[PDB]
Structure 1
Amino acid sequence: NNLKAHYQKTIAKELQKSFAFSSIMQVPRLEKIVINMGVGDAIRDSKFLESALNELHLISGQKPVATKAKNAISTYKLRAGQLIGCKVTLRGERMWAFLEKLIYVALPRVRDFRGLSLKSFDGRGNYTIGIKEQIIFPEIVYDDIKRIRGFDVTLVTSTNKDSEALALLRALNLPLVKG
């Protein structure tokens, strides 16, 4: 990606100067964006889960692996050995492609993207974005599951400090309130 090379040059220079980092790779580096569109309807409407996967596939270019619960609950109708939820973890070129596509196409189409930040870092440098609806994503046709759901896009970084993660986010211009 041309923006990937732009990321290289720009992130290196500003970050290096911003904290006098003694090495170019001391600057934070983003690793992997997990997407987890999971639903318990597979306990009853198994069909739905299948469609779920395809949409997830259609969004990232990686086929989603379906995850299984590690316990069993009667109230939730849960039982061990069943597949409830798919997770995809993008890396390399595809992860940066999805990140740019999200921030530039999907996110500003959000009904009311006022944003949320500073109050999202887990204290170790991660970040989770809770999407409310799937239809807003461009890689989705109107025909879909009878139920509509959101997403749990998350982020990782090489650093362990949440403040430096915020600094990388600002350098990348991820558009949130004051952050």
Structure 2
Amino acid sequence: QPRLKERYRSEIRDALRKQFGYGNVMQIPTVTKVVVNMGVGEAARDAKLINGAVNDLALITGQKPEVRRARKSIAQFKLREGMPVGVRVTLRGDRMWEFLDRLTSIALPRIRDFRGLSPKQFDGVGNYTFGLAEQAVFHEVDVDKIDRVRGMDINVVTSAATDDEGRALLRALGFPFK
């Protein structure tokens, strides 16, 4: 039983009926998935992402990722169709709540010269997306046993209908805004 999930349905779940006037308890927003991908564009050359971009997201998120292939060829990017260019992991259920705790508690203040996250990064429906620096911040990968550094970007997908309905939800979970 992860601590962020039980803290959600103890006081976060009740507080959103006061900030927003819902008439039914099924309308209360809830984060449904957290999607993480590297997006390794330097894999159209050198063919080394199995050792470096799969062995680290397995350690960060818990489960092995999916290798994503290119949909169309681009001549300017030195790319084909069906070429491994992206590496995605999807987090559901109870491993989502443990990743959102472990991101906001011990990970996210290890960004070099960290000052916050911006609250204008909503897509219009209530789904936040930020990005990170490198194979730093997460302790589960070590800095000594790795290849070249590479960053990622993290989606957070809610059931909220609008923007600030998802801003009030992630402020309560523990995303630092400004």
Q: TM-score range by the shorter chain?
A: over 0.9
Q: Counterpart in 2 of 1:89? A: 90
Once residues 67 and 121 of structure 1 are traced to their aligned partners in structure 2, the CA distance between those partners, rounded to angstroms, is: 24
**Greater CA drift, 15-24 or 122-131:** 15-24
Once residues 160 and 72 of structure 1 are traced to their aligned partners in structure 2, the CA distance between those partners, rounded to angstroms, is: 36
Once residues 72 and 10 of structure 1 are traced to their aligned partners in structure 2, the CA distance between those partners, rounded to angstroms, is: 50
Give the TM-score of the pair, scaled to structure 1.
0.93
Q: Counterpart in 2 of 1:50? A: 51
CA contact (8 A) 2:117 2:176 kept: no
CA contact (8 A) 1:42 1:84 kept: yes
Once residues 156 and 137 of structure 2 are traced to their aligned partners in structure 1, the CA distance between those partners, rounded to angstroms, is: 20
Identity %: 50
Once residues 3 and 125 of structure 1 are traced to their aligned partners in structure 2, the CA distance between those partners, rounded to angstroms, is: 20
Q: Is residue 20 of structure 2 the alignment partner of residue 19 of structure 1?
A: yes
- Equivalenced residues, count: 176
CA contact (8 A) 1:39 1:49 kept: no
Q: Counterpart in 2 of 1:168? A: 169
CA contact (8 A) 1:12 1:24 kept: no
Once residues 3 and 35 of structure 1 are traced to their aligned partners in structure 2, the CA distance between those partners, rounded to angstroms, is: 19
Q: Counterpart in 2 of 1:29? A: 30
Q: Structure 2 stretches of 5 or more lacking a match?
A: none
The Cα of 1:172 is off from its aligned counterpart by: 1.7
Q: Letter of the aligned partner of 2:134 in structure 1?
A: E
C-alpha distance after superposition, 1:19-49 (max 9, x if no partner): 2322223111001110011212221121234
Q: Counterpart in 1 of 2:115? A: 114
SS at match of 1:138: coil
Once residues 149 and 49 of structure 1 are traced to their aligned partners in structure 2, the CA distance between those partners, rounded to angstroms, is: 14
The Cα of 1:118 is off from its aligned counterpart by: 2.4
Q: Counterpart in 2 of 1:136? A: 137
Q: Letter of the aligned partner of 2:66 in structure 1?
A: V
C-alpha distance after superposition, 1:82-138 (max 9, x if no partner): 111111110000011011100011101111221232221111111111101222211
Structure richer in helix, relative to its length: 1
Q: Letter of the aligned partner of 2:10 in structure 1?
A: K
Q: Letter of the aligned partner of 2:136 in structure 1?
A: I
Q: Counterpart in 2 of 1:123? A: 124
Q: Structure 1 stretches of 5 or more lacking a match?
A: none
Q: Counterpart in 1 of 2:5? A: 4
The Cα of 1:168 is off from its aligned counterpart by: 0.6
